[PDB]
Design an enzyme around this catalytic site. Structure first.
Site, short mmCIF file in Angstrom:
data_model
loop_
_atom_site.label_atom_id
_atom_site.label_comp_id
_atom_site.label_asym_id
_atom_site.label_seq_id
_atom_site.Cartn_x
_atom_site.Cartn_y
_atom_site.Cartn_z
N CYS A 138 26.37 16.86 47.80
CA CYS A 138 27.36 15.95 47.23
C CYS A 138 27.32 15.81 45.71
CB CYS A 138 27.49 14.59 47.94
SG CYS A 138 25.97 13.73 47.99
N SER A 139 26.62 14.79 45.22
CA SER A 139 26.71 14.49 43.79
C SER A 139 25.63 13.57 43.31
CB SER A 139 28.08 13.87 43.48
OG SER A 139 28.38 12.81 44.38
N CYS A 140 24.66 13.29 44.17
CA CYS A 140 23.61 12.31 43.90
C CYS A 140 22.89 12.53 42.59
CB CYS A 140 22.62 12.34 45.04
SG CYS A 140 23.51 12.38 46.59
N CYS B 144 22.29 18.10 43.59
CA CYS B 144 22.63 17.54 44.88
C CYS B 144 23.55 18.53 45.56
CB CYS B 144 23.29 16.17 44.75
SG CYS B 144 23.66 15.49 46.37
O1 LIG Z 1 24.38 10.73 46.54
B1 LIG Z 1 25.77 10.67 45.99
O2 LIG Z 1 26.31 12.04 45.69
C1 LIG Z 1 26.59 9.38 45.89
C2 LIG Z 1 27.97 9.37 45.91
C3 LIG Z 1 28.59 8.16 45.82
C4 LIG Z 1 27.92 7.00 45.75
C5 LIG Z 1 26.58 7.02 45.74
C6 LIG Z 1 25.90 8.20 45.81
CO LIG Z 2 25.17 13.70 45.99
#
Ligand SMILES: OB(O)c1ccccc1
Ligand SMILES: [Co+2]
Lengths: 203, 228
Positions: free
Chosen positions: A110-112, A107
């Site tokens: 972000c961190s998904c 991701c």
């Molecule tokens: O897509 B994410 O990096 C994510 C971050 C927090 C909550 C839910 C999903």
């Molecule tokens: Co993400």
């Protein structure tokens, strides 16, 4: 990496702790956060939801070609056959490693990560070093960081989770496991093998 | 926005830090930060796209080197202030209080069964972002498309490394919540969603790995036809 501007880890933890406790106290007074709500979320992702679930899906696909077909067609619906699904795995797409293709997931924004099959991601997955580099130098990254050499003639596909689609890697079944039980096969399946940064365990 | 959070392709961020093992939660405050997500969501601080946009507005240096769950705390505060649900002056006063008195109690409160019910339903039922729309998909598998060069200041899922790039539609997924509206408080306005394949040479130039591609998800307005 050295940053002469950065406070000590202890000082950072001290400041974050005070800020979080202050915010917590306010949300508690608003009636929207409680100690039991906090403990329940932690319990679920410490003890109930983790990569052992993904491992069950992988070994079923390995030992059931019809299920594998369904898994690759609609990951969410196939995983529901095993009672697996939910938050941040509402839309799962599994991708199959072969002799010709290797998949790795990231991701970059972000961190998904597919929580229902892998649990919460390890910190390196969420951090800028992995995220920045894997879309740009995946072959070198896999070699240098994970000791995983993907021959140059083999295609690497990097899946960047920019939407709510959650990509999960179905690793190749290791050689020398013919007729193994699902339980025995599961010992070879790692979180890393379902991210694509390592193969399933050999031998 | 063109924030530093959009790290795909950035050089020089350093080697991966990967301990041999690690706990799910490294400290008690991380458990609190994590559980605040369903709490603030239920209370209407933000939806998921807005949550992301709050993080994207962080101080870049702080973003790059802070513990992950600190990002979540920043976006809670951001949206708490935005919605008027968090008074910043009171938050600062309470922060100083808990600096000086770290073991002081939390406020007395009642437990609420409905919050446990909410957690269990969200975790095991999910929060699906898929939606039905009246329009058919504009694109199909095999279509050659180009990613938009638009550069909105508000929330979007438009990684700089794919902008203006040409790729091939791999799959149509149906329609989903559209980040460019939802993350900016403008509602779901769902759009068809596609996975698009970009070669490494398209992304990174003539030097690129001739045997690698990146798959990136594109909402319909992000892409326009080159060839069917
Ligand atoms: O897509 B994410 O990096 C994510 C971050 C927090 C909550 C839910 C999903
Ligand atoms: Co993400």
């Amino acid at each position: 990496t050295e940053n002469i501007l950065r406070k000590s880890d202890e000082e950072i933890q001290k400041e974050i702790t005070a800020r979080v406790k202050a915010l917590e106290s306010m949300l508690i007074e608003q009636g929207i956060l409680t100690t039991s709500m906090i403990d329940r979320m932690a319990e679920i992702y410490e003890n109930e939801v983790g990569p052992h679930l993904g491992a069950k899906v992988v070994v079923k696909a390995w030992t059931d070609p019809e299920f594998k077909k369904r898994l690759l067609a609609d990951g969410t619906e196939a995983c529901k056959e095993l009672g697996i699904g939910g938050l941040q795995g509402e839309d799962m797409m599994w991708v199959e490693n072969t002799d010709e293709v290797h998949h790795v997931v990231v991701c970059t924004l972000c961190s998904c990560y597919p929580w229902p099959v892998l649990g919460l991601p390890p910190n390196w997955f969420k951090e800028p070093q992995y995220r920045s580099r894997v879309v740009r130098e995946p072959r070198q990254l896999l070699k240098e960081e994970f000791g995983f050499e993907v021959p140059p003639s083999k295609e690497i596909k990097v899946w960047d989770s920019s939407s709510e689609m959650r990509f999960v890697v179905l690793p190749q079944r290791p050689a020398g496991t013919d007729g193994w039980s699902e339980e025995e096969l599961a010992t070879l399946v790692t979180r890393e093998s379902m991210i694509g940064v390592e193969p399933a365990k050999a031998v | 926005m063109n924030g530093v959070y959009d790290v795909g392709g950035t050089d020089g961020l350093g080697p991966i830090n990967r301990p041999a093992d690690e706990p799910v939660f490294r400290a008690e405050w991380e458990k609190v930060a994590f559980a605040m997500f369903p709490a603030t969501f239920r209370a209407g601080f933000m939806g998921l796209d807005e949550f992301r946009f709050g993080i994207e507005q962080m101080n870049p240096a702080e973003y790059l080197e802070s513990p992950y769950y600190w990002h979540w705390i920043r976006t809670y505060i951001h949206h708490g202030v935005r919605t008027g649900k968090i008074d910043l002056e009171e938050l600062e006063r309470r922060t100083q209080y808990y600096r000086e008195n770290p073991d002081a109690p939390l406020p007395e409160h009642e437990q609420k069964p409905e919050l446990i019910e909410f957690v269990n339903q969200a975790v095991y039922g999910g929060l699906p972002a898929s939606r039905e729309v009246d329009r058919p998909p504009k694109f199909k598998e095999g279509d050659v498309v180009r990613f938009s060069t638009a550069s909105p200041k508000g929330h979007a899922r438009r990684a700089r490394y794919v902008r203006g790039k040409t790729g091939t539609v791999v799959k149509h997924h149906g329609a989903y919540i559209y980040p460019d509206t939802a993350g900016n408080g403008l509602g779901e306005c769902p759009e068809h969603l596609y996975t698009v394949r970009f070669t490494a040479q398209e992304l990174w130039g003539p030097e690129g790995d001739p045997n690698s591609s990146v798959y990136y998800d594109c909402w319909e307005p992000y892409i326009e036809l080159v060839d069917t």
